[PDB]
């Protein structure tokens, strides 16, 4: 498959996960039969699904990259704040709304300040930086630039390293998925390598120690994913216990990656009629918790990996602004990849 199919698939997958997952967000239990009924409703017998903050911020991030043909922190921060101002009720986290209001002050010349000051200067460690970051890996092909600009784009709202390292990890997963066919072993090894390096930086250790986390929350979790994948038939309760299904970036980004890797293979509980991308989204939502955001992240990775051949027409055409998303993906390709 060509890279254009992967770019289109990436942003479609992210849109599908947000749209299809939104109904269940914050539900502590999501029966698989309920999710299957939900997706079956997208293929009725012959309203759109609305997107949430995850897509609104992903679109603003991509708009900024297209406009400036590069990461531009001021342009992107203002676009985030203005998008919230225009359409505030999309399901944003309570934490980021405080940053947006501060960014809307003309006297705010340092666009990193509002995020940095949150939580008594510790910053947010939620997954808002990661939920929107896929476009960075479409604009920047080098693994060094992916890390650099995933970090900076995340720091506009999520200044804790526990937040921005989650955004880096997610961006790296999308970056690797763009490379195509891989064993789960190889995929994980490459990600583990990066996180072991990044979690040794001083800020990383300091933030984790301040949080009592016996540290390396991402590296430890990537190791756990390898162990989970080795198990014959792991329960959702174990997956949630070991990895999480939460708003914290370390309780959602590894989980998304697990769902991607796990769902490469068939699941006897999920009808064989569903392809791997559909399976990934169905399973991720069935973990409950922060379902739109875990699914939007798993969907970005799966869409980059499987490309448009696994993006279901029925689901996609059910999603608010799917044509807009697709033309934005094409435009990222033209601006950043075609040359
Ligand atoms: Mg959302
Ligand atoms: Mg969410």
From Swiss-Prot:
Changing residue 52 to R: Abolishes hydrolase activity. It catalyses: [(1''->2')-ADP-alpha-D-ribose](n) + H2O = [(1''->2')-ADP-alpha-D-ribose](n-1) + ADP-D-ribose; 1''-O-acetyl-ADP-alpha-D-ribose + H2O = ADP-D-ribose + acetate + H(+); O-(ADP-D-ribosyl)-L-seryl-[protein] + H2O = ADP-D-ribose + L-seryl-[protein]; alpha-NAD(+) + H2O = ADP-D-ribose + nicotinamide + H(+). The protein undergoes a dramatic conformational switch from closed to open states upon substrate-binding, which enables specific substrate recognition for the 1''-O-linkage. The glutamate flap (Glu-25) blocks substrate entrance to Mg(2+) in the unliganded closed state. In presence of substrate, Glu-25 is ejected from the active site: this closed-to-open transition significantly widens the substrate-binding channel and precisely positions the scissile 1''-O-linkage for cleavage while securing tightly 2'- and 3'-hydroxyls of ADP-ribose. It is found in: Nucleus; Cytoplasm; Chromosome; Mitochondrion matrix. It comes from the Eukaryota. GO terms for molecular function: ADP-ribosylserine hydrolase activity; hydrolase activity, hydrolyzing O-glycosyl compounds; magnesium ion binding; O-acetyl-ADP-ribose deacetylase activity; poly(ADP-ribose) glycohydrolase activity. Its cofactor is Mg(2+). Changing residue 290 to N: Significant loss of activity. Changing residue 18 to G: Reduces hydrolase activity. GO terms for biological process: base-excision repair, gap-filling; cellular response to superoxide; DNA repair; negative regulation of necroptotic process; peptidyl-serine ADP-deribosylation. It is an enzyme of class 3 (hydrolase). Changing residue 158 to Q/A: Complete loss of activity. Abolished recruitment to DNA lesion regions following DNA damage. Abolished ability to hydrolyze proteins ADP-ribosylated on serine. Gene3D superfamilies: ADP-ribosylation/Crystallin J1. One of its GO terms (cellular component) is mitochondrion. Ubiquitous. Expressed in skin fibroblasts. Binds 2 magnesium ions per subunit. Its EC number is 3.5.1.-, 3.2.1.143, 3.2.2.-. Changing residue 10 to F: In CONDSIAS; uncertain significance; reduced protein abundance; increased levels of ADP-ribose; May result in protein misfolding or aggregation. Mg(2+) 1 binds at residues 52-54, 292. Changing residue 293 to S: Partial loss of activity. Changing residue 25 to A/Q: Significant loss of activity. Does not affect recruitment to DNA lesion regions following DNA damage. Strongly reduced ability to hydrolyze proteins ADP-ribosylated on serine. Belongs to the ADP-ribosylglycohydrolase family. ADP-ribosylhydrolase that preferentially hydrolyzes the scissile alpha-O-linkage attached to the anomeric C1'' position of ADP-ribose and acts on different substrates, such as proteins ADP-ribosylated on serine and threonine, free poly(ADP-ribose) and O-acetyl-ADP-D-ribose. Specifically acts as a serine mono-ADP-ribosylhydrolase by mediating the removal of mono-ADP-ribose attached to serine residues on proteins, thereby playing a key role in DNA damage response. Serine ADP-ribosylation of proteins constitutes the primary form of ADP-ribosylation of proteins in response to DNA damage. Monomer. It is linked to Neurodegeneration, childhood-onset, stress-induced, with variable ataxia and seizures: An autosomal recessive neurodegenerative disorder characterized by pediatric onset of progressive brain atrophy, developmental regression, and seizures in association with periods of stress, such as infections. This is ADP-ribosylhydrolase ARH3. It comes from Homo sapiens (Human).
């Amino acid at each position: 498959m060509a890279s254009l199919s992967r770019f289109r698939g990436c942003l479609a997958g992210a849109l599908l996960g947000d749209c299809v997952g939104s109904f269940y967000e914050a539900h502590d239990t999501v029966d698989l039969t309920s999710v299957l009924r939900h997706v079956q409703s997208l293929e009725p017998d012959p309203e759109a699904l609305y997107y949430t903050d995850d897509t609104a911020m992903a679109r603003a991030l991509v708009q900024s990259l297209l406009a400036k043909e590069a990461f531009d922190e001021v342009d992107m921060a203002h676009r985030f704040a203005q998008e919230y101002k225009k359409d505030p009720d999309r399901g944003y986290g309570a934490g980021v709304v405080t940053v947006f209001k501060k960014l809307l002050n003309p006297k705010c010349r340092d666009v990193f300040e509002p995020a940095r000051a949150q939580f008594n200067g510790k910053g947010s460690y939620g997954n808002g930086g990661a939920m929107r970051v896929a476009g960075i890996s479409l604009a920047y092909s080098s693994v060094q630039d992916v890390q650099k600009f995933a970090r900076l784009s995340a720091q506009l709202t999520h200044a804790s390293s526990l937040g921005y390292n989650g955004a880096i990890l997610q961006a790296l997963a999308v970056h690797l998925a763009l490379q195509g066919e891989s064993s789960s072993e190889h995929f994980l090894k490459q990600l583990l390598g990066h996180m072991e390096d990044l979690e040794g930086d001083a800020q990383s250790v300091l933030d984790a120690r301040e949080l009592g986390m016996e540290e390396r929350p991402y590296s430890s979790r990537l190791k756990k994913i390898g162990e989970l994948l080795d198990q014959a038939s792991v329960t959702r309760e174990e997956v949630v216990s070991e990895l999480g299904n939460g708003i914290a970036a370390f309780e959602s980004v590894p989980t998304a990656i697990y769902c991607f890797l796990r769902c490469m293979e068939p699941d006897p509980e999920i009808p064989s009629a569903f392809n791997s991308l559909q399976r990934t989204l169905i399973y991720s939502i069935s973990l409950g918790g922060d379902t739109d955001t875990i699914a939007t992240m798993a969907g970005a990775i799966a869409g980059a990996y499987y490309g448009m051949d696994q993006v279901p027409e029925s689901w996609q055409q059910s999603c608010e602004g799917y044509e807009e998303t697709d033309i934005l993906a094409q435009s990222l390709h033209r601006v950043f990849q075609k040359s």
